Amino acid sequence: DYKINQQQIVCVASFLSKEGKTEALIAALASLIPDTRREAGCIRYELNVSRDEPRRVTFVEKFVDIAAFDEHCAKDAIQHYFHQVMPELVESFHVETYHQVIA
Amino acid sequence: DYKINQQQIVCVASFLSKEGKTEALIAALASLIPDTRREAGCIRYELNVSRDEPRRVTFVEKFVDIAAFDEHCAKDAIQHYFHQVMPELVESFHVETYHQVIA
Amino acid sequence: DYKINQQQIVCVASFLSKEGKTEALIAALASLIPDTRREAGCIRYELNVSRDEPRRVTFVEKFVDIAAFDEHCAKDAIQHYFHQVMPELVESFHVETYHQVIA
Amino acid sequence: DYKINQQQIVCVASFLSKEGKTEALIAALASLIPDTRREAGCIRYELNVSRDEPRRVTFVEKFVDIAAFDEHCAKDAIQHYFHQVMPELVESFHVETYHQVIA
């Protein structure tokens, strides 16, 4: 009835901005998009703003495999975001990776 | 630099299974897919199993607009899942809707 | 076994460049992408270069409905491309619209 | 301004049915979908019926790379379709592969 795709990697990464930092956070995350979409192993890299918690900004991502996901995570702009940008703008966050279930 | 799409609706719905209920939960959620994909206003309806918390199963969804999302949520099989299936299989869950940010 | 989605609109539009005009054609078509992706009713707008006929450049598109497709086609940049750019760069072309079959 | 993704493979495959064979053709092509979507390297495999030429049925496809595309093309059901089904149902067809242009 269903089969788990054991190769492709899905990631959902949500970020809760600090008070007054939501526009800055959306801008910081959106700045990552053009180069990420140009990665050979990037399938999907979509940014989203919550209708329920307007401080929440979330990436919905897909990569051809875990090597491509790891390559993405080691990119300079991504590491700069985690190390330098995030501590100034974000209260809390959550990152989860997945395999897709095909039915 | 970016524009929020104010029409299309993104939804991320994550479900944490009870101990021993993960396979039953994946099956219950996967059973919803064929009819949902056949909804005129469904763009995306993808099921995913967590690599980090293997009891977690998550839908990543997109609909043409909020009317189409509301129509989906009122479907008999969806309401049956929430009302009848979920209480037996799920410890906790989270549903969040979003607008997509285009950069 | 399958259901045709009678609402959403798929379009495939292929363009065969004149000799020596392929890079100019890719550039002209790519210039349309950022504003099209920002259309409320645009789902997909992907540009592709043929591996089999390297003068061929093709858009693969999806819109929430025919009104959104018609809105896209009436945009100034799209009409400028058809009227002004295409006659200089393109030998021949084909545009086809579709409904998606869900199985 | 743009970058060609040299890894992922896009395919558009259109089939023009013989008179009276369109429903049979849609069914034959749709029968390929469930197993193809379950391929580890399949990203997209979408079937479409033409609004302009109702005998035309077209697949819009994407695979993680050329090895995954070649694997797909060598599958028993795909070869059975080409060799056994297509000659009975199809007047003419066209298959084109592409690399995606990211802008």
TrEMBL record, chains A, B, C, D:
GO terms for molecular function: monooxygenase activity; oxidoreductase activity. GO terms for cellular component: cytosol. Residues 9-98 form the ABM domain. This is Antibiotic biosynthesis monooxygenase family protein. Keywords: Monooxygenase, Oxidoreductase. It comes from the Bacteria. Pfam families: ABM. It comes from Shewanella oneidensis (strain ATCC 700550 / JCM 31522 / CIP 106686 / LMG 19005 / NCIMB 14063 / MR-1).
